[PDB]
Structure 1
Amino acid sequence: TSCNPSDMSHGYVTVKPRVRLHFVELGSGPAVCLCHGFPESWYSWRYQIPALAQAGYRVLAMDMKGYGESSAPPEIEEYCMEVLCKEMVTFLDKLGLSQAVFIGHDWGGMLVWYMALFYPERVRAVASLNTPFIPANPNMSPLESIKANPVFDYQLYFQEPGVAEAELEQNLSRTFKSLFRASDESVLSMHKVCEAGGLFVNSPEEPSLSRMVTEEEIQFYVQQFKKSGFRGPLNWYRNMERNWKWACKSLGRKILIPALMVTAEKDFVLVPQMSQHMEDWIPHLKRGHIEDCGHWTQMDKPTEVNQILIKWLDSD
């Protein structure tokens, strides 16, 4: 049970002159806002949208800024957490929603944590898939926290505007088939991306279709990314200094709203152990864990994702 795009309600909200945000909407009850990661789409929530609606929730599945039918301004600073969060609050204002539950994955995970810290009054409850909440280290540069973790090398590859874009936009069909794979089907090492050409140099030219996706599902993502490309999406990675600067102003404060951290056993970039000290900042934090599950959590173990989210939603 997934979604057909033309059978959904499509919403559009202008949060500022140059910027409209597009979303899909299904169900009635408390408002649940779903925020995808990189490089995805509202469509990445196709298994959760109908399930949460049927569980008695009003689901808003976003195209995040830079993606799909949402605006994709070229300026890098338009995608820093501060600016993205304010727009999400403007979004709630224009829909007349005093609060929403926020659920995010990957970069969307990151964003909802930030909403929880800087806009707790507008966030009823907060849930993240894969993305942990790591307090800002005011002494360690952000750039530094990477050259200290080997699997984050691709993030440096993403910094130079035009470089990752041109490789990722080269064959869009190849890009998504290469990325959207189970952990055991993976054909990418995140180790040595900068020195050894790009992200796909040593991976196949005509990669096979993963067990998780159909050819029709891949083509939806292709069509979405034809309209703005990867620049906007990648600009999410190009604000680490600003995001760190901004995060440090919150250094003392605590998330007191209900919170859920869901970890994927086989996400080799957003590892479960990265989240291990989160109760030290959120004592009441609930958890879920999903075995045999990679980075693309919603796609990989949709049934477990739905069970975990619904159980948490119905209780806190």
Structure 2
Amino acid sequence: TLRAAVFDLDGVLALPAVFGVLGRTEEALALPRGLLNDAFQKGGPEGATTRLMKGEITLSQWIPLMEENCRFSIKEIFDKAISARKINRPMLQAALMLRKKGFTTAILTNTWLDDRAERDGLAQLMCELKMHFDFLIESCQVGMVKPEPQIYKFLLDTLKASPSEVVFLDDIGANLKPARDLGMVTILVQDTDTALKELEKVTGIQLLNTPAPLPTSCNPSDMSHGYVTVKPRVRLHFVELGSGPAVCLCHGFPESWYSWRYQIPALAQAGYRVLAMDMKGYGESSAPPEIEEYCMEVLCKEMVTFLDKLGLSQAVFIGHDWGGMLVWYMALFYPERVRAVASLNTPFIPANPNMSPLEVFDYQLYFQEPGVAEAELEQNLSRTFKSLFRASDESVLVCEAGGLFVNSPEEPSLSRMVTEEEIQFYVQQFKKSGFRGPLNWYRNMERNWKWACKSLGRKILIPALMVTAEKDFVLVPQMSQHMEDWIPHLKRGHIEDCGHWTQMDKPTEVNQILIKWLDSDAR
């Protein structure tokens, strides 16, 4: 039985093949057939290309030697061919499905050491692909090349498997040949669909016509964890991924940086430097007990200090729920520090200066009395998160009846939005500080209103996005209707059949909405 799948890069995981550009250049320039392909393979295992593929020489050293075997521009031809080569999405998807089902996956490729001025494009491609596989074996790093028999024995050694346990996929029959002679299952890849039919048939796993997959998530132990002391007793923790303009993600109640797990790899891949916060009172961030430590004024001031200490003059701020509330106040009180602002679910409603704030919000009154909601929420963490984190149809949820979970099961079923593993991550995070810090975010209504009244004559004029979730019953889309009065250039997004837990309910659409808005309005 098969337990490992091995894929080539050029012509298998990445298309169009760089090999196929030599033939196209010949046809475009009306040169003799196979002229450029011949110059490329000139000298066989003794030639310039074999030296390049073994890592003896770099791509820039090879360009003049290739120009020789040819005797326009080889650099220009290869630059265009490398730029045009993109990830073969259905092939990646099939590799992803096999790994998910327990297969050890690997990429085995004949490649070079790229020192071209434009090497970054390829570096980015390899980075995106590699994260999805157990191993990446590059000819130029191992000083071995396909079809030499040693690279295959090296592949089996790294895989810790016998040939009969390995499916090997390649677009070059000659490179496929030694794997077969060893006893491996082999697929000659010409067109993707037929290759996948062959793969599906031999593995007994459905790979073709499969349902739309969820975006890539985060493994906590694989992330870069950052820590910033904003004041003597206050430290802020964040997860960081990517390069480009800074995008600060702000979760709600009772959440985590992990609530953005589906957005982090997507936003970093779209060209942003993502900073996913543990908001004050949560996870690895500090959780002081005092109520006043959680008023909007102090939270926003600490987020400014967080930027100060990291050396960031600005960040784009994206918030959900209480994070969405924070983000509107960052835009109103610190516009110089906010590149752009986006809120998921939380509308921006100016404070009524002629009315106190306490005058679907029975939840907020139950949360007022210190200790009451903490007692109920901390009693059984697994139950708390399983009851809370549910889609619109999964509804398991007043104050009065004396509690949030009065007519709720002791052992709720697992929502379709989460796995048992993901629930347990939240359980482990909440074991450190409990619910006091998180609940204090609701305990500053009067302070928050007083502070908000100072902004009543202002408008939000920096780039802004409001994202509504059709089926959020706490933060209803209708509550955002008058926002344009205060944010005239406000851009919008809307997600149908989406509950309160936007990021995990509808991750694909959240990502589509944010990336499109970031690229048009945030740089």
Q: TM-score, normalised by structure 2?
A: 0.58
User: Per-residue displacement from partner, 1:276-313 (whole Å, max 9, x unpaired)?
Assistant: 01111111100000000000000000000000000000
CA distance in 2 between partners of 1:199 and 1:139 (Å) = 32
* Cα deviation 1:169-198 (Å, max 9, x = unaligned): 00000000000000110111xxxx321010
CA–CA separation in structure 1 for the residues paired with 2:485 and 2:441: 28
User: How far apart are the structure 2 equivalents of 1:119 and 1:133?
Assistant: 16
Q: 2:384 aligns with which of 175, 194, 202?
A: 175
Question: Aligned partners of 1:195 and 1:99: how far apart in 2?
Answer: 45
Alignment partners' CA distance in 2, 1:268 and 1:310: 26
List per-residue Cα deviations over 1:33-73 (Å, max 9, x = no partner).
Answer: 00000000000000000000000000000000000000000
Provide the rounded CA distance (Å) in 1 between the counterparts of 2:400 and 2:410: 20
Measure how far apart 1:248 and its partner are: 0.1
Structure 2, gaps ≥5 residues long? 1-215
- How many positions carry a matched residue from both structures? 306
Residue 122, structure 1, aligned to residue 331, structure 2: no
In structure 2, how many angstroms separate the alpha carbons of the residues matched to 1:307 and 1:185? 25
Higher relative contact order (CA 8 A, sep 6+): 1
Displacement after TM superposition at 1:102 (Å): 0.1
CA distance in 2 between partners of 1:75 and 1:10 (Å): 26
Q: State the 4+ residue runs in structure 1 displaced beyond 3 angstroms.
A: none
For residues 194 and 44 of structure 1, the distance between their equivalents in structure 2, rounded to whole angstroms, comes to 26
SS of structure 2 residue aligned to 1:289: strand
3-state SS of 2:317 partner: strand
Q: Deviations over 1:110-133 (max 9, x none)?
A: 000000000000000000000000
User: Which residue of 1 is the match for residue 362 of structure 2?
Assistant: 153
TM-superposed CA distance for 1:222, in Å, is: 0.1
The CA deviation string for residues 138-192 of structure 1, in whole angstroms up to 9 with x for no partner, is 0121001xxxxxx10011000000000000000000000000000110111xxxx
Query: Which whole-Å deviations, capped at 9, do the CAs of 1:182-224 have from their partners, x for residues lacking one?
Result: 0110111xxxx32101000111111000000000000000000
Deviation at residue 260 of structure 1 after TM alignment: 0.1
2:234 counterpart (5, 12, 19): 19
Query: Structure 2: how far apart are the matches of 1:34 and 1:299?
Result: 14
Write the distance in 1 (CA, Å) between the matches of 2:474 and 2:440. 19
Cα shift at 1:11: 0.3
Distance 1:194 1:114 in 2: 29
User: 1:27, 1:230 → 2: CA distance?
Assistant: 31
Name the CA distance, whole Å, in 1 between partners of 2:313 and 2:361.
Answer: 37
Measured against aligned partners, the alpha-carbon deviations of 1:85-115 in whole angstroms (never above 9, x if no partner) come to: 0000000000000000000000000000000
Aligned to 1:88: 303
Q: 3-state DSSP class of the match of 2:427? A: helix
Output the CA distance in 2 between the equivalents of 1:194 and 1:200. 10
Give, in whole Å, the separation in 2 of the partners of 1:138 and 1:291. 34
Shift of 1:258: 0.2
Distance in 1 (alpha carbons) for counterparts of 2:323 and 2:487 = 19
Paired-residue identity, %: 100
- SS of residue matched to 2:330: helix
* Structure 1 residues 242-266: Cα deviation after superposition (integer angstroms, max 9, x where no partner): 0000000111001110000000000
For residues 407 and 364 of structure 2, the distance between their equivalents in structure 1, rounded to whole angstroms, comes to 18
What is the CA–CA distance in structure 2 between the aligned matches of 1:127 and 1:281, rounded to whole Å?
15
Q: Secondary structure at 1:256's aligned position in 2?
A: coil
Q: 2:513 maps to what in 1? A: 308
Larger Cα Rg: Structure 1 or Structure 2? 2
Query: Does 1:284 find its partner at 2:489?
Result: yes
Q: Distance in 2 between matches of 1:279 and 1:158?
A: 31
Whole-angstrom CA distance in 1 between matches of 2:371 and 2:484:
40
Write the distance in 2 (CA, Å) between the matches of 1:161 and 1:10. 32
